[PDB]
Amino acid sequence: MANRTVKDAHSIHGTNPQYLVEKIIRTRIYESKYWKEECFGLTAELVVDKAMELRFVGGVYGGNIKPTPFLCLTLKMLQIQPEKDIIVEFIKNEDFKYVRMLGALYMRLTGTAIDCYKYLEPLYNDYRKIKSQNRNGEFELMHVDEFIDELLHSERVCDIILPRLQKRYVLEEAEQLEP
């Protein structure tokens, strides 16, 4: 199936990276028009085109837990596991705050503690306003640094449980660099 994690991908927190997202939420995403239309055939280098069109952050909303585009792209990234510097580039980008948010969440889901501290803590300096779609369908306003604070200190963001951070200096592929 085209919804299966790519074959070259390695495990994340000891499991399929897509499994970080609730099963019923994954099923809703797979069924969604956004996944079927915008996410179909999306490769690592193509994600940014869709990420640049994002207009808010969020998880799911409503009595049938409809996923946001933000959440759909997050799962797609979990599925195809982009090379690290793509994620870093999203984070470092200053023109598109939602691209920054998407990279930041993905980094929190997949990175080491060292990764998160290195790449996310500088974003505490970002006070820009962002739209967030809450469980009821409304759009609330928050700041980037608040989203970052939640990534670093909350249990859940965009309706995804944030995995236990790995303290130990750990690499998951042989060809990874050694900072």
Curated annotation (Swiss-Prot):
Residues 1-179 are annotated as: N-terminal protein interaction domain. The modification Phosphoserine is found at residue 11. One of its GO terms (biological process) is mRNA splicing, via spliceosome. Keywords: Coiled coil, mRNA processing, mRNA splicing, Nucleus, Phosphoprotein, Spliceosome. GO terms for molecular function: RNA binding. The keyword Nucleus applies. The keyword Nucleus applies. It is found in: Nucleus. Involved in pre-mRNA splicing as a component of the spliceosome. Component of the spliceosome B complex. Interacts (via N-terminal interaction domain) with ZMAT2 and MFAP1. This is Pre-mRNA-splicing factor 38A. It comes from Homo sapiens (Human). The chain holds residues 1 to 179 of 312 of the full protein.
